[model samples]
Every structure is written in C-alpha cells, then in structure tokens.
Target: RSSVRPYLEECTRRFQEMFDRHVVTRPTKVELTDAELREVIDDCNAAVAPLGKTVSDERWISYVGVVLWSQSPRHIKDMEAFKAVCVLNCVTFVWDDMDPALHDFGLFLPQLRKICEKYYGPEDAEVAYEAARAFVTSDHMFRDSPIKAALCTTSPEQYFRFRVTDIGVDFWMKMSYPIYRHPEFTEHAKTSLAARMTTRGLTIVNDFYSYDREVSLGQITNCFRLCDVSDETAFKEFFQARLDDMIEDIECIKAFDQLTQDVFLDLIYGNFVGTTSNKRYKTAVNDVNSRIQ
Candidate 1:
C-alpha cells in the first residue's frame, strides 16, 4: 500500500497544479497571524495526544491542514472550541478509515464525546453529540466510502447535497457555536443553500486532493468515481466544472450577508481550493494512512 503514495502523490500533484492554475474563484489569504495560529495549533495538538492521537510530523500537518489552517476561521479561534473541532476531526478521520461494521464501534463515540463534554458544558455538548450522530447516521444512510450503495442509490446532485453532512461541516461548526454564529448555520445546515453548496464545493475539492489516497484505501466514492470518465485527468476536468458551479451557487444565494458570503468564500478558496498547493495536506494524508486501522 505504501507504493500507493507514489501514484497518489503524482495524481495529487497533478490535480493540485491543475486547480492551482485553472481555478478562477479569487484566491483568499489566511487571516491567522503567526502567533495566533501558533496558539491555536498548539492547543489543537494538545487536544489530540490525550485521545491517543498523534502529534507526529505527519499527523500534525494533517491536523494543521484540516483544522487549524482550514476550518478554524469558520468555526474556531478559542481553545475550548478549537479542541472540540480538531479533536473530533481526529476521531472522525479514524472512524472513517475503519470498516463499516466497526465505524460506530462502542468506545470511539463515547470517548470523543468526553473530549467535548469537558470543554463545551452540558447543553451545547448535547447538541454537538447529536450533531456527530447525525454525521455518522448520514454516513450509514448514504452508504459512503467503500459501501458505494450511495453511488447507485443517489444522483450526483443528491449525493453532493447529502455530502454536506458527511463532510461534517455542520457538526464541526455547531461544535464551534461558542465562536461562530448566524442563521445560515447550525440548525440551518441542511435547509440552507448557503451552507450546502459551499460544503459541496469543499467536499469536491477534498475529493480531488485526496483521490489517490481514497483509491489506496479502497472506497472510491468521489464525484468522479461515480462516472466512467476514462482517466484521472478527465475526472479532474469534471471536478473543476463542479467547483466553478459551486462558486456561482455561493455567490447567487440571497440568504447570506456580504460578510457571511465572504467568509464562506474564504473557506472554499482558502481551505478547500487552497488545499491544492498545500504539501501539508499530503503529509496529513500520510499521517492518517500510517495508522494501523
């Protein structure tokens, strides 16, 4: 499987550079200051080790790419919430890497909930717990990853729409309620186009960046996997078209304010699209794949 990394990295690099040159949504900057990001990432790493997750170079880069640098702006800034988002992502990534029968195994959910309870107080943690439940439940209902039942059962549009929950953006953001707030989020994640399209965009972008990794892992449920597009290059062109459509979806929606729209765009360009050039993302991939699972 380690040999997969070469094919993986080559495919990843191809998509990375292709998106780098071709994606037209304006590039956005990381708003995190050096010191600010340091504290954030430090606390983020601090959350992982206690859960038996690692802070090794590989895992650290993954945590940084996924949490600290990617979604933090949307749902994080403080340590308590930061710990929840980062640590749960750690847990979710682990669970997703497992066999479907064991994905909801007894201990993992409870242990991860402990991390949330200690930080988010009772009421908020309760909602966050259910949010997580909703996430995993969606996974089963949708038959994600290796299941592929979702692929045959759902259309591309329906799958992309449902992909929002599987992406965990809703719960991750809810877990951050102490930080991020607005009508376009939380209870509105499923109903709101503002939330759905952007997450669809994010998931597709991840599908591109992690395609080869997913191929190695064996599930292969990305936007392209459902289609018989011949080669990975053709797969990428379709992904690019989906990405451009996402931008239109994000921009045309009448629901969000300019500021909200801007932040959502940054999540796409800064984190989703930005992952294209992020070598740290590849390290994050290696980090998770290195786990014994």
Candidate 2:
C-alpha cells in the first residue's frame, strides 16, 4: 500500500510538470494556422500514446484492485491473490481500450453481467443490473466532471477519486463476493452491498469537481473536518461556519454535507489537514493565518 503512494506521487509529479510546461507556461499559440496546431496536437498524442496504453492495461487495473482489496477488512488473509486479481482486472480493462480487438468491460456490460450471473446464479440478474446501474450512474462518468477529466486528462482530482473509489468498491465487492459466489447469504449480501454502494455513490457526488472552479485549500480542509467531528455541537459549529462562507452564494451550499463538515472539523482538531503530511499541513495553516493577520 505504501509503495502505491510512491507510484501515485511519481505520476502526479510528472503530470503537474507536463501541465506546467505545455498548458500553463506556453498556451497554444493562436497565431499558428489550424493545420499546424492540429499537427502539433497529433504529435503530442503520438508521443504519449505508448505510455497511455501501458497505463490502461488490464494488469494494471487488476493490480490496483488487489491493492485496494488488500486495504479492506475482508480477505486480508490472501493479500497476494487479491493483488494479482486486482492487477489482472485493471490490465484487462486497459488492454481492452488500447486494443479494440480485446474485450472491454466498458463496452461489454454483458461480460460483467455474466460474471455476476456465474457467482449469483441465473436469478441474480437484478443484482448485476444494480451494480451496472451504480457504475454508469456514478457522477464520475459525467463529462467535464473531475473523474471524467482524470480519466481523459490525468488530472489530480481524477487520481484522488480513482484511488478512493477503487478502495471503496473493492471493499464492498469483497464483502459480497463470498455470498455472491455461493448464494447462501444472497439477500443479506445484496442488502449490505447496496448500502455500501449508496454510501460510495453519495461520496462520489459530494466530491465531484470541475477544473475551472478550483476547490480552495480551505474547502479541502473543511471537507476532511466534516468527516471527523464527534458531537452535534461541534458539527453544528462547523456547519455554521461553512454556511456563513457560502451564504453569499447559496448555490455553493450544494457542495457540502453534514458528514463532510464534521470530518473537516475533526481533521482541524487532529491537525490532519491537506493531502500532505502533518508538517505541511501546519505550514499551510500557519501561512494562511499569517496572511490573514
């Protein structure tokens, strides 16, 4: 799991560097003719094609799935097998994209249906349908959303959501898989699984972002705090502050949740703000405080 962090950081660093150099510093020169600009775009695409193919491979997906599964409570005993399956699932999906001849889960929803059927028997069509529905309805798939952009453009938000969702989905899937494979706990598993899916679904909605409206550091910290607060009083205080911040633009209130507000407050108390370590979190807090003063 820790090793996964380094891989993620490396990718993030590369992406940021590339974005800074190409998109930020040197905006596409408008003076260039359309044909010339198209050529430049084509060349850039060509340069990145191989790397993109590798990243999308099924082996990678399976590895990622395993990594996430390993992080969950279920099947902690067979970490190695879980990791292998995760990588395989990831690689299969990736390979499917790069090589159109190969089967892609995205294109062939039936394949997923088939797998569900095998595990749950012929009658579990509803369960499979629900999973499919959840996957498609996921705000992540919507165009221009953070998850979509991440998939397309490799944005940081996409990376964050991908990891988070992977862990979440894997956790629930593993929890339900045994029953799914053997049908004894069919009803129980379905209920539990659906509950997990709903929780994750809410999480996805809450976290969705657009590139243009950059979420501020304060928003991010508060989101974490919203997850942390233990009592109603603290939660109310935190929510009040958030409401005050968004009162000027009531529409922005849609972006918040009581749970998220509580988490942010808790993080504030625990000093666990930001994506960075505690030291960086403290520095950021200090810098903001200094600026205000």
Candidate 3:
C-alpha cells in the first residue's frame, strides 16, 4: 500500500522493455596496454608527489583505469586523441583525490590550471581554473551546511545547484571537446539540448550506481541525499525514470543531422553504459538487476 511501490513496479516494467531492445553488453574497453596504463599512473604520481602524497601505483590504477576505460568514446577512434583523453582523466582524477582542507590550493589549483591551459588553451583554461577554484571553496560550504547533517537537500532544484558544480560538468565538458579540434562544433555540441540532458543523466546515473558504496561508507555527499524514499525503492524509481527520459531524449536527438547525432549518442549511450558497467559501482545485492526483474 506504499505510494512508491507503484512507481517502482512501473520502472521495472519499463526497464525490461528498454533493455530487451536497446541495451547491450558493451565491455569496458581500455585500449591502453599495461605499460601505457603504468605510464599514465607514473605521470599522475609525478604530478601529485610534489604535493606530498605518494599513492601506491595499485590505487592509481584502480581509479584511473576506471575513467580511462569508461570515458572512452566510440566516436573518437584516434588512438592519440584517446591517449590525451586518458591523460586528462588521470590529471582530473588527481584533482578529484585532493582534499581542499588537507591539500593546499596554492599547489593544487595551479597544477590543475596548468593542465587545463595545455589541454583547453587560455580562454577555456581561465574558465576551467575558476570553476575548479570555486568548486574547492564552495564545496566546503555545502559540506559545512545543514545538508550534511540532514544528509540531503529538500528539493531537486537545490540539489542540482550543488551537484552540477560538484560533478565538474563545466570543467569536464571543456576538457572533453577541445581534443576533437573542432572548436565551433564543440561549442554547438556543448550548447545543444542533447548535451544538457545527457550531462544531467550522467550526474544522476553516477548517484544511482554509487549509492551502495556511498551508503556503506556513511558518505553524506551522494545522490541519496536527494532521494527521500527507502534505498531500494529510490534506486529502482531513479533507474526507471532515467531510462524513460533517455528514450525520449533519443527521439528528439534523431531530428538533428547525422554528425550531431553521433556526438549526442557518444554523450548519452557512452556515459550510461560506461558508468553502469564499471566495477567501481558494483554492489553485492544486485539492486540494479532487481529493477529489471
């Protein structure tokens, strides 16, 4: 007799329909060999070591390998371009690992700023630097806010206000398209409706899959903060809504030309499968599978 029960059941039904037709078993593909992965790790370590953290190569591999493999785009077939993407992922991963409170921004921010400039140039780099700087400062205020104690914000609008920055949507998007060398097309793609929806989808999908690990660690900063329902019901409901929303998003995307459609698909399907299939989000109970069943 619960209000959420019906929503969850419908989501399960809808998911089954979608999976049968659309979803496929795309394995995690990290084209880089063991030596290349180690090289990437070494570069990340060299960058971070001066900051006083010598993370074991194993830890770096676990984290960097996930992003390299998951964020690899099917549309971008160039190995060199993908290698640059892998480097960006490594450096950004380094940024993610830094704690503003413990790690000095004096060193950390500049390092990221330098990396951004090299990859994205002065104009975007200035913007990227500011976003990264602001994120460090503002992220702490949220941590100190009542939301942490409450374990969530009261509304979706408010939730996304913080999550958008926290996810580094602006920063990552800037770092992404420049490597393609089509600045005008990059601008078009970034400004498109499909990009907005897919970015939103990516943020929410991360929250959904990361719920189990975040909960296990008693982490307050996760998508669960916004979901008021029980964990199981919330997960099922979220998955269903996103699946339904994405199907509709595809129909709209079809109206665009083939080239634009390719970019849209890379953002939508690529990130969805990449995040879902990554081992980082794996949970023992298999709530994701239960949603389909």
List TM-score per model, in order. Answer: 0.70, 0.31, 0.70
RMSD of each: 5.3, 18.7, 6.6
Question: Candidate 3 lDDT, tens digit per residue, 210-260?
Answer: 666555544455654555545667656655565666576566666766655
Residue 192 local lDDT, model 1:
43
Highest lDDT against the true fold, candidate: 1
**TM-score: model 1 vs. ground truth:** 0.70
Per-candidate clashes come to 0, 29, 0
Model 1 residue runs over 4 Å out of place are: 1-57, 72-79, 100-104, 137-147, 150-154, 183-194, 229-237, 253-255, 277-287
Ranked by lDDT from best down, the candidates are: 1, 3, 2
Off by over 4 Å in 2: 1-106, 117-120, 124-126, 140-175, 179-188, 192-293
Residue-by-residue lDDT tens digits, candidate 1, 1-293 = 22223345555555446435544445444354666555545654554344444455454445445554454353444566655665666556555554565554354566667766866778778877777767766665554443355543366776665566777777665675554555455444434444565676577667655656665665445665665445556555665576576656655543566445544655565665447556634643554454334
- lDDT, residue 189, candidate 1: 43
How many Å off is the CA of 18 in candidate 1? 12
Q: Is candidate 2 or candidate 3 better by lDDT?
A: 3
Better of 2 and 3 by TM-score: 3
